[model samples]
Target: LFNYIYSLMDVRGKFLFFSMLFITSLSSIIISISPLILAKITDLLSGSLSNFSYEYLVLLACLYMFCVISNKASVFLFMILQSSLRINMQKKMSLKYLRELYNENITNLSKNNAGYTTQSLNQASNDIYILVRNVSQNILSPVIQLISTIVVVLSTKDWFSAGVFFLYILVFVIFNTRLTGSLASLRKHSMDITLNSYSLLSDTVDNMIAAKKNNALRLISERYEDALTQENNAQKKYWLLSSKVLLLNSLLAVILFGSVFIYNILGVLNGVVSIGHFIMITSYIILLSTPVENIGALLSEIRQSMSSLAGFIQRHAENKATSPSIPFLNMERKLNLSIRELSFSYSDDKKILNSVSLDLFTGKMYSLTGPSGSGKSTLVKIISGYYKNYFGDIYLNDISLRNISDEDLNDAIYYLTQDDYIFMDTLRFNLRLANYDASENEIFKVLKLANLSVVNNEPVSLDTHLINRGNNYSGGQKQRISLARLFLRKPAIIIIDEATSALDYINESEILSSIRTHFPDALIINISHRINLLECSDCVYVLNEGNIVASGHFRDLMVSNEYISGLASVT
Candidate 1:
């Protein structure tokens, strides 16, 4: 916990934490010294009348009031300052996690590790304020109070009572250390069990719809209850152990205070320590017990906070940032995209693409056709820069794909898949996401090109919301809208993976013709079985299993390659 706390510190963070700690410690000292007022009163009553004055009494009353006010002020500051730290920390963590989610690199977290990291994001910061309070105020204030109490008791009272009180503290520390040791393992185990159970329950709840649809509610309930029972058993053991330790300390406190009470009485009878000194000794001894359990509880919270923080660190320990990208300029230079000997598999022994090579040119169109599971979609994903773990090389304008920053690459390429989800917002808002600076005339023009000119006469045309919450969009309309989005982007390279599967041939051809006419300088690679879209391809490649077997113009491939002939006819 302290590791994470220390890492998050900056000049402002350090100032906030230490300054609040100072106030918290000082407040304990003030509250600890409250019993001194009682000592002063006792002394004033027993002393000579001439030595005490009404003005001195007023001064003590003022000091008492000052301590009370300052103590409350310190408490208020602790909460505000600590909460400030928590809010900022939560913000930073949220940003870091969000970046990790989008990072093109795995960025230290494996695909399987992502779920636990998401859990950490939501589970953290909930108890952070209390964690900091327990660690800083509870621990520091108790230490300060212990030292101040020792001085108050020893100086005002005789050595005998002081010796006895110190010995009682010594004994408490020894046993508390052992109890803390036991709690350390218990605390860690209890937290692990609960967090694991929470992950299971969360998974079950997230898939509740699927489970109910499949009539697997009983199975989900059984698994959830099993996890719950395990967590319940561990929690019960933890509390039971914790209570025993508290009981031990409470009784030990009773016997020790009672012993000192008796010792002070004997000392008074012996004329060793006076009445005011006796009161000081007894009062401060009782005061020492309050912040002592603080050590145990603070460590408990600190450890849990630290454990939860571990997940975030483990996931994002690898930094995930693209190289700084050069600023975008509106240039229309033809660029060549080349791929060579590229191979990838989701796992070992399951190769999806093998030695797949292509020479692609800007201003030309290409089509990739293959049977299902023949690595067509995977090849598109690789060129679009989704799966970067593949073998061999891809280069754009002779610049290696890996060397180009994600932003720079994204500026040059746009990938539209078959199932682009509607944003459940206004049509204009959705288009704005493609290019916020796109003009109204440009938007309406592209809408016409995408066959969305049908809706142009409607009064609230662009303002119409895409009601994705319901089945409000026809499949063909959604496909056209996605195509319109790509037209607006006008990136240097466009990869469409079955992006027109729902549209009829006429609409699809109209949209493709518009793209070819308007975006003459843009390279378009499409994966589709549609005959017209494939025929429009300047070049076509046939993929079988994990390898490409044929490449040529549409009619040439249809005449020369039997597989290609069958593929073109299947459309």
Candidate 2:
């Protein structure tokens, strides 16, 4: 546990963290001496005023004051350092988590969802904070103070009292341990419910428009309410369980403290102990019980934090092991992609694509037309390196897709889907993401080509801001802006999967024409239901039930194939 915390810190942070701990230890040691000094003063002051040694009393009192003041100073410094260290730890963990997420595969990401990932990171950070507090306040300070209290009690009091203290410690720990075990189990359950609630909330917010459009807003609301209700119930159970454990520990503490006080009182009455000795023993008992009282709650928190950290580590390991080692993509010449008997399946029993083959070359446009659920999108995803567990080989520029690194594959292949992500930032910021060093003239030229230079006949400048992932803009404008990214960097292959569906025929054709004109050397594949748009393609491949049923020029297939003719006539 300390190893992971130390690993997250640099030399300076580690130094600061250890320094705070050292100072805290010193403070606890100083604070421990206060009871001993008070006991000494009490014994000395039990007689007449004439019997008191003025110089000795002044010396002892000054020493006690010094210890108290120094302890407070050290504690103040520790608090300051703890804040700095906590912030440092949190920042490092967040950055490391982000890098781990960045390297994860889309397949894994889709399964986990955004809400779970975000909440996991948040929980991990919270666990670190709990770790710091438990180490300093609960574990370190309490252990030190307990030891000091025991020593003072044994030396000042007697063996009977010491044995009684030891017995109390034993019984308290055993019962508390048993009860906290249940608390930890309940804590884990509550945490799972919390994660589910957040995931439900995120899902609802993401598809709010869909829910409204389908007239399922009430249904979505009910689902979210059920999730929250479950979370609330889980939390209530955990808190009640925790309180029960605390209440039982409190009862044990009362028995120990009261019995010790009564036993000491009997000893004083029997002339075996003085009034000063009785006071000193009682003070030490109170001091010792503080830490003992806290141990149960501390155990519960420590168990919860440990479990959380364990989950974080497991997730980090899984994400790191997500992708296989592969060679860098080598696209030095015009790209020629050959898909030889390509096949894929999400599961063994349900094959989505079977023995699919195609030869794609640069400078020619190929249109892919298919019915819904015909594996058109799945095939493109596989080609784009989104899914890696496919059969057969896909060779790009004579190199196998399996051998190519994801970074290089992404750099060479640009896949534009219908719903592409738009940054909630200025137009300039989003455009610059495609090519950071792109000039103003280049940006304007691409915008004009994609027909995004103007909106409502007014020039849409670079500084225009986007809101709600470009919800402020029309659908056609959003698609055009997304297409404008293609003009920034030329890719070896470009796949447009219904990306221009939002645009009118005139705008769509113009943008497609611009793509062809600028990237003449790039292999382009267009997927659309629009037969009119497929007329410009060199050849159209018709897919049905994961198989390419027909392939020919649009005009040639119009008369020969009834399926193609029917689609054309419908358009």
Candidate 3:
């Protein structure tokens, strides 16, 4: 109910939801009133015997047909509204989710469950829609009908019968309340186990290659079976509890009906209730029981829905926090980056970077060299404005990085990470994402610069389809294709975080020379462990334990800094 009301705050969505809800409610009310109309017809026939008018029967038949048609139309409209609003909300929320995910968050998100994150997003959206619809149609409508019936029984019939009906409703409510409480905890546990099992399955499929290479297929299979066992156990317990509750509820309903039957018989004996009245009361009670049973079943669903809603809301909040703040400034031409006293820790247990500071000049080639886990990739992410919670300041030109808008920042800096994401599309279409208006000639030029022009010699030229994530392409080929995309963007600052590390020496040298020739004016921040790559840079900064231990020309650093000398010796 709260969620439904909250949805109403959005005027357009609210209008659509309410319009459909009104139609559905009217249909239900009309349907509920049909029984009373039928009862009235019965009384008319009983009083008239052989004097019954055919005209009155015809009128009733026409009204019944109209009501049926109206009900069906209302139901159809309700379903349309439900489906449309669900899609709209899902789309809106998904857009917001994408907009909110920062580069650092994206990296972490990818690491955890890249595929399932999308699935979770889609599922949450669907759940929210179902929840809202159920609340409106199932919960609210039935409740209203129950109230109306009680009022009619009290006013039109005897208070004694109404009192009995009220007692039954009270008992039904108590039973449902108790049942919901008993099932809530079990349902939550079952859902947790289910999600865990799904996550495990996704992981196994994604890492099939690694599993096969390590000969850990049996291990992974065992883990999967264990997850399945946990899920099954939870499900079994939940079903068992649910069945018990259902049985108890059914028994209570039977007892209530038996009590009502006895009361009706006693009233008939006293001449206070007519035969027709007793039948009408009994029919109304039976109709009321249908709603009562529905309510009990819906209560369990509502509880589960509330859990899903809570999880969705929590995830949304986390995504919101990780989203980059909108920047206020634009990127023009000259790009300068300055880092001061920058410190970051992923958690209290692990400090990834500490008090790192550097200045990058425009159009200069700078290299960052360090061993693995020395925060090389982390530094590039910070520079590219992917992570925002560091301790110090990063200035682009004279303006703080936070002052730059996402669009402007994207235009200013391009961070090409080691892992390249390839879409299942033609090479041309994939490269076009970097520069949407790029011509085929322009694309070919960049491809040539990246040493990927050889692809053009293929039967399909640039139109050749790449398998998902470029699985059809070699590692070096994928790297070169990614480089072509980076070149097309023509960013002011290109932060290459081991962009060419996957390539062979010859290919790496060719790509490096091409970058020097084609993008001479662009600032290049190359992060690599290779001394050969560092030697190509105008300046080299050697990072040790998240701090720059030395910074100078590559030769000078080798001659002067012991750490750089030792690293060069080893590699």
Candidate 4:
């Protein structure tokens, strides 16, 4: 399982992991040898009748100092390496998962909580790191120490003492294995209850405003409390089971230690072992017992870690696609999109679009007006190559969209969705995402085009920081920023889904005028409920219940369709 998890890491990650192993092994060897040095010191101190020699004392001090410094260095190196590897692995895992979550899948996956998916991703990555560290420090190191202890005791003393130690090791292993088997079901149930409870709580909190408006807070809270009670009960049961296992393991440990001590006393009384040898044997047995007694606890941790690692590995592996397409490298013409009988459904229970067909030409302004839930956004997603599983074909410049690599399509289109995300950075950095190599003059030009020049006229200019989701700015400002980004990149095709719905009448008119004046040669597709904006378009397509119910110029459609007239009446 660990190997499968490791396989998902990149080459650098693999190299760093090997480096971690080398360091762990070196540290383990250093720690294992310290007891031997102490034993030597004890023997020397007991044997000498006179005061200790300076040479012996100096050698002992130097050895102790060496061990201390090496151990510290090993710990520091291990921590640094482990932290770096974990952080990098987490980043890679998050990116891989997010890249797989296309527009449509996002809604499904994020239904529980907006933050839950991210939290799970973080937890899984962290758990894998914990597992890796435990296997190195707890499992592998203890086993090595146990073997060394057995060999040292048998060589210096008798096989009887070694036999006692081996028996204790066997009992510890067997009891841990049994406990693990018993706790497996309880752990699984506990995890399920916990995740479900968290999901329900998240849902309740996310809809708190709506709940309050509807006077349903009491009902929501009751449901959350019930989930919490269930989760608590599951946890209580799991801990109770764990306590029983711990009690049994503790009893077994005491019995094993008592047997070893009794055997040591017998050997010493029979003169089969010297007094010093007896002390050494007892010390070795005690040393071995420490890890043996703790093995049950460590085994439980290992099991949890294994489960977490499996989750991380499964999530990571799911992101590894066989195809290598960049989605935007070839097509340079704007507004060269074609859709042929596109049909899409989320599941068997819901169909969002049915046999939708449209054609867009370069350097023309087109408008799509539709009521709510009319598949307007879905159509844009299909054209942008986000929904490839839909039934039908999309083409850019007569080349099938699937046949055209992602690298080519990305260069051809720019999509401005309704829900814009603002990064926690300076506005300049945010704008750079659209056009990385844009010059200062070009940046200012787009800012003006987006009608954000008034805001940039302040002392901060483009250096002004945007808070989470640009809460510091008005909705109009946020929309203008998104528009500025599109203008800077200047893609062949610009698709806007309700881009100006949040703007005031004057601002919206100005934005529309800017698009028509500056990007006159670029293909523009605007999806909006605002029918007045359609008058600026050369052609208008009215969508209703996932079908193109009316198509023509806005003036012609207004005269021919009552729906268009009603939409015009509202605007």
Candidate 5:
């Protein structure tokens, strides 16, 4: 973690960080010595009038004022440094994480539990800021202050008091260390279980429609309640331990301070300790107690943050490495894709695709159909550059898929699935995501072509706002909005996976024909369970249990392949 922060800062930031520490140390030293001057003033005032030197007393007063002003100035400078470092670290961490996300493989991304992943990232970033702040303000400054107070006591030649203080510090530190040592592992467990509960809640929220349709809302609620119960138990256990540590801290504070006060009072009564010296020591003890109390709380929080960050790192490992930098694909002409002896499996026991070979080219429309478990989606996902752990090679225009740069691959292929997301923003904002440079006229044209020119019998202008995930729009309307994005970009290879299943046959066929018309030179792969949809395709392939069972025109397949014929009859 230290190395991560060090790498994040430039030379100037590093310099500023250390400079703040220097100022904090200087301020603590000055503050510690100011009490000595006050003790001197007290001593002079307490004595008889005969031996008093007014000039010396006034000079000590002026010196104390100077120390106060200097410390305040240092504090201002410290604040400046702290703010800048926070801003720098925050910006760097967020942008770095976002870049890593952008470059991650889609296969790994899809496997993430969304709520847990999102909460972890947010907590990780916050933990970084909190750690940095605590190091400077709570840890560094308080440590310097505590050390200076002990040094002042030692310099006073009050050996008994100094020795007692030393013993107290040693015992206090060891007790706190042993008490909080197990907190890290316990915190890690608590964070994991709590985030799991949150993940369930997020999943339920996202799938409320499905739960309602299936009348499973009560079941979902019960599951969420069970998760919350577990979370409550874990949290109660953690906080119970924390409360005991805090109670022990207060107990130690009482034991040390109570003994010191009684011991100092006896010394003063016996004339062994001057009243002013006793007051100064009492002030130092009170000041030192603050950090002592805070140290336990700060340690507990720091350990918890570390555990949360560890969880973040565990989740962050899901960002699998992308393809190596290589030559960009040539896009001057229509792309030709060749798959030879391709095979893929999620695990040894769960095979998805096996020796699936196909030649796909531009200016032709191909339809792939299969049963639910057949590997149609898996094969298309691999072709779209999402999965890379396949057995055979895929070539895009004779260039190995492994050798294509991410930029070029993204430019060449566009995958649209039924789960396309709609942001809660203006219509223009979502449409412009496909082509940032698309003009208003071009957007209007595509929206009209996609039959999305109006909604609720009102024209949808560029500024039309969408409800949450476009829930106000019907399923078919959402699909049209997704299709409009394809019309805007016109990538060389387009994969549509059940994106138009919600549309009526007439509308679905019209959109298919429109796609072909607008992208005549592009290779199109359409996956749908609707058997009749394959009739317009130049070729249709049937897959069964991870193998290509049949391929031909829709009519020929209907007559020759029983599988496809059965699907047609069902449709």
Candidate 6:
């Protein structure tokens, strides 16, 4: 973590960081000595005032001005260093994590654990700022303040009083150590269980309509309540322990002050010790104890922040290795793809894709029809290069997938999943994502082809804005907008999974025919169970139990296989 921060700052930032640290140390020393200055002033006004003169007054004024100047300089320097380090660390951390996500394709992401992964990233983003503040406030300043306070107290007071102060510090450390051991693990558990409820809250809010219709409010609320109870119980246990620690602190305060009074009253009054010495020592003891008492709370928070940051930093360290520069993708007109004996398992025990193979020719339409859990979508995802871990070979234009870089592969293949997203932006900007330089005429052409009706005849045309999640449009229109972007790109190979399922039979057929017309020289792999779309496919593969059992054109398969024929009847 220290190295991560050090690498983020330039030379000037490093200089500023250390300069502020020096200022903070000086300020603590000045604060500790300020009370002694008051003692000097007090002595000048007393029975010992016989020694007071112009020299005493000048010395007092100079000390006061110096203290003021040191404090002001300390605060202003800390303020400059704080924001500068925060933004620098933030920028560097974000760039690293974003690259990590893209390279690994948000590795291990799935519906069940998506929350944990995303939450980790979001918390990691916050860790930079937390670490920055914690280093300055919780660790550095408190340490320096506590050390300087002890020094000043021992210097002004007698050996016995200073020894008693040492015991007070020992008592503080013992109490703090025991309290931390008890609650350190508890705080971590509480933070985790409390954080788990956030994903549930997010899901509940996002799926409110489904939850309401299914009457699942009771079930979800119960789960939420369970999480909240554990969090609260953990918090209650810590507070119970905390109250005891705080009580112990206040109780020890009695022992400290009582010792000072018992040892000092006779010394000052019997003319053995000056009253000025008595006042200065008493003030020093009080000031010295302040850091010990408050540090308890600061330690609690700092440990919690570091606990969260550890996992974040550990993951970042794993991805911190460097790689060579990638050449930008330059796609050709069309390229055939071949998958031979490809096999995969999500885990050791459960296979997802088993010995799946196919010859997907460019400039031809291919179809995949399968029962649920038959690995149709899995093959599509892999073919789109989501993962390369498998048993066999996948080649695009005789270039092995393992040999192709991510940058080049992405430009060659575009996958439109069943739940493809439509951005909440002007239609022009959304369509322009595929090709940013697309002209108004080309945008209208694809929009018309996808049946994105311009009902309003508004001046915005392609620049028409969408509502939240594109909810202003009908379900069919949103899907058409998604299709328009795909058409604009015209990539070498397009693997579409149920893209037009939202449209009516008439509209769905119209959109399919238009897609083929526009991309006559491109590979089209369609995954659908609809007969309307399937009958037109040049070749159809029927997948069941994670294997292709039949492969033929619609007419030939209909005559030969009852399974494919039955599937056609069902659709």
Which pairs clash in the backbone of model 2? Answer: none
Summing lDDT over every window of 10 consecutive residues in candidate 4, give the lowest-scoring window: 315-324
Q: What is the full ranking by TM-score, best candidate first?
A: 2, 5, 3, 6, 1, 4
Question: What's the TM-score of every candidate structure?
Answer: 0.81, 0.93, 0.86, 0.80, 0.87, 0.85
| Candidate 3 local lDDT, 1-571, one digit each (tens) | 3654355336667777777678767876776665565656566565653434556766776776787788789888988887766655655667656765543355456555755565666556656665677666776567766887787777775777778778877887776777785677787677667777778888898889999999997899999999999989999998998898888877876787777777889988998776667766776776776567657757777777677667756754554343445536556577878999999876658778889999988879999988788888888888886777788889877788766766777888888987988889999988998999999899888877888776546633688799977998988788878898887886889888888988888888888887767677788999988877888898998887888888989888877988678767885
Q: Per-residue alpha-carbon lDDT of model 4 for 312-397, expressed as tens digits? A: 45544453323355454555545477888888886648778878888888888899988889988888877776656678888777
Off by over 4 Å in 5: 3-23, 50-95, 209-218, 294-303, 317-322, 454-458, 568-571
Tens digit per residue, CA lDDT, model 6, 374-420: 98888888887776667898988877777777667667887887875
Task: Give me the displacement of residue 22 in model 5, in angstroms.
Answer: 5.6
Q: lDDT per prediction? A: 0.75, 0.82, 0.76, 0.74, 0.81, 0.73
Clashes of 5: 0
lDDT per residue, candidate 1, 28-64, as tens digits? 9888877787678677777664645556666777887
Candidate 6: segments with Cα more than 4 A from true spot: 6-23, 48-107, 111-127, 138-157, 170-182, 253-258, 269-272, 293-302, 315-332, 437-442, 456-460, 569-571
User: How should the candidates be ordered by lDDT, best one leading?
Assistant: 2, 5, 3, 1, 4, 6
Candidate 2 lDDT, 270-379, residue by residue in tens: 99987777887787776676567547547778888887678778756674434554654456647888999998998679989978999988788899998989988899
Error of 3 at 18 (Å): 4.1
Can you tell me which runs of candidate 2 are displaced by over 4 Å? 112-115, 209-217, 319-329, 347-349
Q: Choose the strongest candidate by lDDT.
A: 2
Q: What lDDT, from 0 to 1, does candidate 6 have?
A: 0.73
Per-residue accuracy of model 5 over 1-571 as CA lDDT, tens digit each: 6677667777777777788778877777777777788888888887663534677788889989988898899879989998888777767777777777776667666765768777766767777766665666567666777787778788998877777777777888788778665876776677778788879989999899899999997899999999988888888888888888778877887787778878999999999999999988887777676567657656766777767776676666564655675754466458988999999988668878978989988889899998898988889888877778889999987788888876777788988975868878988988998899999999999997787887789987878788988886789988988989998886889899998988898888888888888888989898998865698788998989988989889989989998777878974
Q: Please tell me which model should have the higher lDDT, number 4 or number 6.
A: 4
Candidate 1 local Cα displacement, residue 227, angstroms: 4.8
Q: What is the lDDT of residue 76 in candidate 6?
A: 84
Residue pairs that clash (backbone atoms under 3 angstroms), model 1: none
Model 4, CA-based lDDT: 0.74
lDDT of 6 at 131: 60
